[PDB]
Amino acid sequence: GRRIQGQRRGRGTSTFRAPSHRYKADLEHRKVEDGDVIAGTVVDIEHDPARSAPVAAVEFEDGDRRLILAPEGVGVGDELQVGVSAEIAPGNTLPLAEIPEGVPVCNVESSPGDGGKFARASGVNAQLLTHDRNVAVVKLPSGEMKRLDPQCRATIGVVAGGGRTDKPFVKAGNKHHKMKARGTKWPNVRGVAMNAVDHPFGGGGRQHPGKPKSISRNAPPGRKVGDIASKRTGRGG
Amino acid sequence: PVYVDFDVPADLEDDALEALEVARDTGAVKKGTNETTKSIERGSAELVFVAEDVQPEEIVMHIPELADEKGVPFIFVEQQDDLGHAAGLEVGSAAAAVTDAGEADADVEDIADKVEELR
Amino acid sequence: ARSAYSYIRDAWKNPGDGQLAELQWQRQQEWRNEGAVERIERPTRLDKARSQGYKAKQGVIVARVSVRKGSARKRRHKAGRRSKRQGVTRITRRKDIQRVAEERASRTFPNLRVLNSYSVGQDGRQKWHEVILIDPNHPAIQNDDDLSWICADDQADRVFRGLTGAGRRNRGLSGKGKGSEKTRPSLRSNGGKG
Amino acid sequence: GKKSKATKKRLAKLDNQNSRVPAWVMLKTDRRNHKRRHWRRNDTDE
RNA sequence: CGCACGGAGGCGAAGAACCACAGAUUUCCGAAUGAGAAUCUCUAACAAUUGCUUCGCGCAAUGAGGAACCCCGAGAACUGAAACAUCUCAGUAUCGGGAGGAACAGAAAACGCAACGUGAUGUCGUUAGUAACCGCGAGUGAACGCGAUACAGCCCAAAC
RNA sequence: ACUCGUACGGUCACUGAAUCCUGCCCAGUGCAGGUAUCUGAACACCUCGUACAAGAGGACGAAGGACCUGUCAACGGCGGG
RNA sequence: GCUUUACUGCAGGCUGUCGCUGAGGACUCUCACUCCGGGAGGAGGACACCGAUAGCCGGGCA
Ligand SMILES: [Cl-]
Ligand SMILES: [Cl-]
Ligand SMILES: [Cl-]
Ligand SMILES: [K+]
Ligand SMILES: [Mg+2]
Ligand SMILES: [Mg+2]
Ligand SMILES: [Mg+2]
Ligand SMILES: [Mg+2]
Ligand SMILES: [Mg+2]
Ligand SMILES: [Mg+2]
Ligand SMILES: [Mg+2]
Ligand SMILES: [Mg+2]
Ligand SMILES: [Mg+2]
Ligand SMILES: [Mg+2]
Ligand SMILES: [Mg+2]
Ligand SMILES: [Mg+2]
Ligand SMILES: [Mg+2]
Ligand SMILES: [Mg+2]
Ligand SMILES: [Mg+2]
Ligand SMILES: [Mg+2]
Ligand SMILES: [Mg+2]
Ligand SMILES: [Mg+2]
Ligand SMILES: [Mg+2]
Ligand code: NA
Ligand code: NA
Ligand code: NA
Ligand code: NA
Ligand code: NA
Ligand code: NA
Ligand code: NA
Ligand code: NA
Ligand code: NA
Ligand code: NA
Ligand code: NA
Ligand SMILES: [Sr+2]
Ligand SMILES: [Sr+2]
Ligand SMILES: [Sr+2]
Ligand SMILES: [Sr+2]
Ligand SMILES: [Sr+2]
Ligand SMILES: [Sr+2]
Ligand SMILES: [Sr+2]
Ligand SMILES: [Sr+2]
Ligand SMILES: [Sr+2]
């Protein structure tokens, strides 16, 4: 047949790419040697085209203008501290060791000094639970207990822009606009509505899949469609 | 480095290179790794010199183990160009050998003894 | 008596034993962080270099080349092919890694001509070969009774035409009798059946 | 369309090539411009 | 005073025309090399990669072309098998790299008419559709030797 | 590439606004988890064999399979008497 | 051209084994190698990646 849509994706053509040239900043944490004497004042609160959540413009003590991931409640004029012995205030970045247990945290690092990987979407938060000299157990937004290094930096508080998923898109045009700002080809034509040549579920006199939808993990790209390695399907049982 | 099992002090090296300069003007010396190796094999070697900055380490690699099974004493020199100048050459030398010393026999004897004590 | 050279030779008979084992473990760490073709002042294997034709003279260059390990890096057929010609994984190239090395070297040095090459080891993913290259234009060679043959017009780009020893060995030209019916005088003359 | 200096020299040449075979060549050879190009009917390069 | 038999005019015995060899000139783009560009332009140029090196582009090399031939790599399918998969078409077509006026080969870790024999290598004739291969199907297919052509044998590494 | 992205994400599919709802079936097929036991290739190892080799047999045994379980808004099924 | 539990194969995924690969049937380590860090240094670690081979799945493709 012909290569399926998921195969055209990896080629990285214009249609499947993200409008990077229209994106503001790659939100990473500031690189401090040691100490704490790094503080800044929030100049502006901007809209980030990349994640739909707001982003805070901060100017530091050493005169560095960089955008940072905005938590809830952080406004213009406010002072945020970054360092080891930073004040345990919402919006401050300090390693997981220094942050007390049972406190909601965002922009958590994987390997210490990477700039933040986990809990970065609108209104989400990671929960810090257990402490040790070796490990800091953080409960990520998916409900998974991630065992992390205590030297991994994290910003205190939940991410701003919460409850975005609550209000519906209502009309196709609103989805259109959102998708034109992301790295996604939209709209989605069902495989079952295509020809046999185009997709494993294409063909027939009526629209139904050919074989069962639950595909094996070992399936090759071109065949791996539908329910990928499903442990189960349905709602009941 | 791989063939070096002991660090020779700067003072002991100064004595050794001084003894080599008077070994050419009185007795006789061998210049070059090939001529050093043949001297250890023919038994006509009293004291053998080997440089520490030899790249590749292969050229000189064999001297420490060969001298041990032939009873010939050896000493390490840090630089290659200094051993060449000491043997009386414009170029450098990876290894030099003293084939029968001359009016330095008493100095060479003590240098051979200072090295054995340094293991 | 034994030459000093014979000791470098005897060491390289077993590159995984003795002092050389430690020397390779150390040197390869620096080599892996070097380029594809790296010119070096002095050969790692002096005996082999001299045996192959190297002289510590002007216009005699040596370079280390790293080429990847394994079979062919081949693309699968995008058109109709019968079962026999549908292979990708088990296909190997007709030129050995030593020859790929010699060629990469001669291209980095468009004025020089390949004299010979030799293996200097491998790790789990790449192989290293040092190539002796000669300057046909330098008078230090044009007057050398041992190396002036390489200055002839017909020796131009000799590696790409398989005129190297590694070339002639890979072309199946070693044997003078039985088994070399389709190799001598050339593979092309024998309809490419070698 | 905007023409360059080289493009102009070429168009200038093509216009000159479009002139008739002089009256005297007919008398010298004792008896046709095969490269007759029209602005509408024919087509130039570029 | 070309093709080219016009008109006007001119050149040649100061030996023109014409032919041979040699030299002068030889715009721009072009490997195209100071940088850019649909043959033009902008402000000293071996651009790039190398060798030597006075370590300065100072001295050099490479690049691209050529009817086919030559050498080194990549490598089909139609087709034949009365289907077809191994096989065949075929190491063919086509593609990548490269040299020369010819290429390649070449002075035995050969042959093995087994000998008390031959004596570098190509090529030609033959050996022979033989040996060998093969859904042992269709098909595929040498060599040693022999007769010729032409002949030519040497240099390193190491020992000292 | 997704990605100046990080689960309020984005990938892969199905259904097709709202409203009222969405029953029963895991035997087959698919996917996934488990598995005492059975089955499960090559390397190495052991036996025979061969002055060596081919080769024959054994031992151990991965994924997978057998077997068990989960799953139908997974393929689909919902009859005869 | 297209389909599949048609024939035969080819990619791909999973898995064992050999090489890279090191010190002291379960375990410790650090020196190769990998990743994070601008750096100091940190995480991981003889595994993973890669090369090779074997078994299973394999209309994704011929
Ligand atoms: Cl969305
Ligand atoms: Cl060459
Ligand atoms: Cl004979
Ligand atoms: K065929
Ligand atoms: Mg970022
Ligand atoms: Mg939605
Ligand atoms: Mg778009
Ligand atoms: Mg749709
Ligand atoms: Mg349709
Ligand atoms: Mg299909
Ligand atoms: Mg429908
Ligand atoms: Mg339907
Ligand atoms: Mg066919
Ligand atoms: Mg020929
Ligand atoms: Mg006009
Ligand atoms: Mg230019
Ligand atoms: Mg047919
Ligand atoms: Mg038949
Ligand atoms: Mg054939
Ligand atoms: Mg024969
Ligand atoms: Mg519809
Ligand atoms: Mg990296
Ligand atoms: Mg098919
Ligand atoms: Na060259
Ligand atoms: Na063959
Ligand atoms: Na026109
Ligand atoms: Na001319
Ligand atoms: Na030039
Ligand atoms: Na220069
Ligand atoms: Na037929
Ligand atoms: Na047919
Ligand atoms: Na066959
Ligand atoms: Na069922
Ligand atoms: Na058709
Ligand atoms: Sr970074
Ligand atoms: Sr980041
Ligand atoms: Sr269908
Ligand atoms: Sr239900
Ligand atoms: Sr030197
Ligand atoms: Sr050339
Ligand atoms: Sr027209
Ligand atoms: Sr002859
Ligand atoms: Sr079932």
Side-chain angles (χ1 to χ4, degrees):
Chain A
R2 290 160 88 198
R3 310 253 253 222
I4 63 167
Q5 198 176 272
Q7 291 183 280
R8 268 80 174 255
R9 268 194 61 230
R11 284 190 69 240
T13 47
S14 193
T15 306
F16 304 99
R17 268 184 284 157
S20 301
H21 65 302
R22 288 203 261 110
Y23 288 174
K24 284 179 181 176
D26 189 49
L27 312 176
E28 299 182 295
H29 290 323
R30 227 198 75 93
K31 295 152 192 179
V32 188
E33 308 82 60
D34 204 59
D36 197 65
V37 291
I38 297 297
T41 313
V42 186
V43 183
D44 206 6
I45 299 300
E46 290 172 79
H47 171 79
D48 186 22
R51 339 160 299 106
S52 279
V55 65
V58 179
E59 194 183 299
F60 293 99
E61 277 180 47
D62 46 290
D64 242 277
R65 182 73 180 269
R66 284 158 82 263
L67 292 179
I68 207 153
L69 172 51
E72 201 160 310
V74 178
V76 176
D78 300 40
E79 190 165 30
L80 309 176
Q81 291 140 49
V82 187
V84 193
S85 52
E87 201 178 285
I88 310 163
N92 284 31
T93 306
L94 57 172
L96 287 165
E98 319 286 277
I99 304 167
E101 310 178 344
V103 181
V105 104
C106 62
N107 209 6
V108 211
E109 298 191 315
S110 215
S111 181
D114 62 35
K117 304 293 194 183
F118 314 111
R120 289 173 62 113
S122 298
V124 301
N125 64 93
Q127 199 74 63
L128 182 56
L129 298 176
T130 314
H131 253 128
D132 203 77
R133 294 185 174 164
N134 292 287
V135 76
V137 179
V138 190
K139 194 201 186 197
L140 301 184
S142 54
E144 189 215 291
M145 305 283 263
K146 189 71 176 180
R147 299 183 91 254
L148 282 174
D149 199 88
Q151 203 52 39
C152 280
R153 311 185 200 109
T155 311
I156 304 174
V158 305
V159 183
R164 189 198 53 204
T165 305
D166 297 342
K167 181 220 189 70
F169 278 107
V170 173
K171 56 177 181 182
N174 294 345
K175 234 284 177 52
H176 168 82
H177 291 308
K178 195 217 179 177
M179 237 88 247
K180 188 154 177 164
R182 297 301 198 272
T184 321
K185 161 68 208 179
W186 188 81
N188 309 304
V189 177
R190 285 119 61 237
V192 165
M194 306 181 169
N195 286 327
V197 65
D198 292 318
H199 191 87
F201 296 161
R206 69 190 132 83
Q207 287 180 16
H208 67 119
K211 306 173 187 169
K213 301 195 294 184
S214 299
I215 192 62
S216 165
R217 245 280 136 49
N218 307 316
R223 189 186 174 210
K224 187 180 273 180
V225 292
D227 311 329
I228 307 173
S230 67
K231 296 163 189 68
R232 56 165 290 157
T233 52
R235 307 199 85 197
Chain B
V2 293
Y3 52 89
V4 181
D5 295 280
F6 54 92
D7 186 40
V8 176
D11 303 89
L12 226 173
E13 193 187 328
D14 285 308
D15 286 6
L17 293 174
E18 277 179 83
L20 192 58
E21 285 189 80
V22 295
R24 49 167 164 126
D25 299 303
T26 321
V29 287
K30 297 300 189 197
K31 319 160 186 177
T33 316
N34 204 24
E35 294 192 75
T36 304
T37 307
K38 293 182 186 297
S39 282
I40 302 165
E41 291 161 345
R42 287 165 176 172
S44 62
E46 255 153 56
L47 186 70
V48 296
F49 289 75
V50 140
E52 288 182 53
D53 67 339
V54 188
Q55 210 291 305
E57 294 178 65
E58 271 107 339
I59 304 161
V60 138
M61 230 166 77
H62 65 294
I63 311 290
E65 199 202 271
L66 192 69
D68 286 339
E69 55 207 65
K70 285 279 183 161
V72 182
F74 60 96
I75 186 166
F76 293 122
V77 185
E78 313 281 309
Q79 290 181 80
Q80 211 184 294
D81 300 83
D82 294 338
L83 190 50
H85 191 63
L89 280 172
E90 298 171 77
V91 208
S93 184
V98 191
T99 175
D100 288 276
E103 293 181 274
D105 296 86
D107 301 300
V108 169
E109 194 178 66
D110 284 300
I111 295 163
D113 285 312
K114 279 176 183 174
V115 176
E116 286 255 76
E117 290 161 53
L118 186 61
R119 172 236 173 199
Chain C
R2 281 185 67 172
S3 60
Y5 302 130
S6 74
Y7 282 90
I8 308 167
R9 198 172 75 202
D10 220 273
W12 276 89
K13 278 183 184 172
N14 291 302
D17 292 330
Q19 289 190 306
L20 193 53
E22 203 176 42
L23 246 181
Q24 283 297 280
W25 184 86
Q26 284 169 31
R27 253 186 286 133
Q28 285 179 9
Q29 287 179 61
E30 286 155 45
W31 292 356
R32 288 175 193 115
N33 291 321
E34 280 179 28
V37 183
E38 290 292 315
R39 178 180 173 173
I40 55 160
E41 257 184 83
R42 289 289 175 266
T44 300
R45 297 172 56 170
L46 234 194
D47 60 299
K48 193 74 175 180
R50 291 190 63 85
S51 184
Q52 279 178 5
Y54 165 90
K55 279 186 172 184
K57 212 173 199 178
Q58 292 172 100
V60 177
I61 288 85
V62 181
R64 193 184 309 118
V65 192
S66 71
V67 186
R68 85 297 179 275
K69 263 174 70 185
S71 71
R73 270 72 188 148
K74 205 190 176 175
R75 303 182 60 91
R76 190 173 183 279
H77 59 287
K78 293 158 215 299
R81 251 63 164 188
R82 53 171 189 125
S83 77
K84 236 278 167 176
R85 311 302 188 179
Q86 283 199 33
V88 193
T89 309
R90 295 172 197 202
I91 294 179
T92 53
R93 314 248 96 141
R94 297 182 190 231
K95 258 193 280 187
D96 61 321
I97 291 167
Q98 178 149 347
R99 241 144 92 59
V100 190
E102 293 186 349
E103 283 189 49
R104 276 171 194 188
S106 202
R107 260 177 190 118
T108 296
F109 299 107
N111 55 306
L112 314 180
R113 292 174 187 177
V114 179
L115 189 274
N116 235 308
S117 70
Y118 53 89
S119 175
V120 284
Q122 57 170 90
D123 54 33
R125 57 204 220 89
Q126 58 195 303
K127 278 184 191 170
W128 284 280
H129 286 82
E130 289 185 353
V131 189
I132 303 159
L133 300 101
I134 307 300
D135 192 334
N137 301 291
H138 203 309
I141 277 132
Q142 299 175 328
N143 295 310
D144 195 321
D145 291 275
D146 297 339
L147 304 180
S148 65
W149 57 268
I150 211 158
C151 299
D153 286 335
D154 55 42
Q155 290 284 351
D157 285 317
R158 71 196 307 272
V159 67
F160 308 109
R161 298 179 296 134
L163 308 191
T164 290
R168 288 169 179 148
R169 277 180 269 114
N170 181 65
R171 287 200 285 162
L173 286 172
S174 297
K176 296 193 72 175
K178 193 223 295 172
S180 68
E181 298 87 352
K182 323 232 179 303
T183 75
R184 190 168 287 101
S186 71
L187 295 172
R188 204 186 169 250
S189 74
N190 293 299
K193 294 173 209 180
Chain D
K2 306 287 176 293
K3 61 181 74 68
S4 71
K5 196 188 185 174
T7 294
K8 196 168 190 184
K9 283 168 76 184
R10 292 182 209 124
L11 283 169
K13 180 174 177 56
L14 286 166
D15 177 53
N16 196 224
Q17 290 181 281
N18 230 261
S19 54
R20 196 179 173 79
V21 185
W24 60 266
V25 177
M26 305 295 264
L27 303 171
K28 194 182 180 184
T29 62
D30 296 315
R31 300 172 201 174
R32 285 182 161 268
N33 200 302
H34 309 113
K35 285 190 171 185
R36 275 187 189 113
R37 178 200 62 79
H38 193 67
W39 58 274
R40 212 179 197 157
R41 279 290 181 142
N42 289 279
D43 209 72
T44 73
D45 279 357
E46 302 146 72

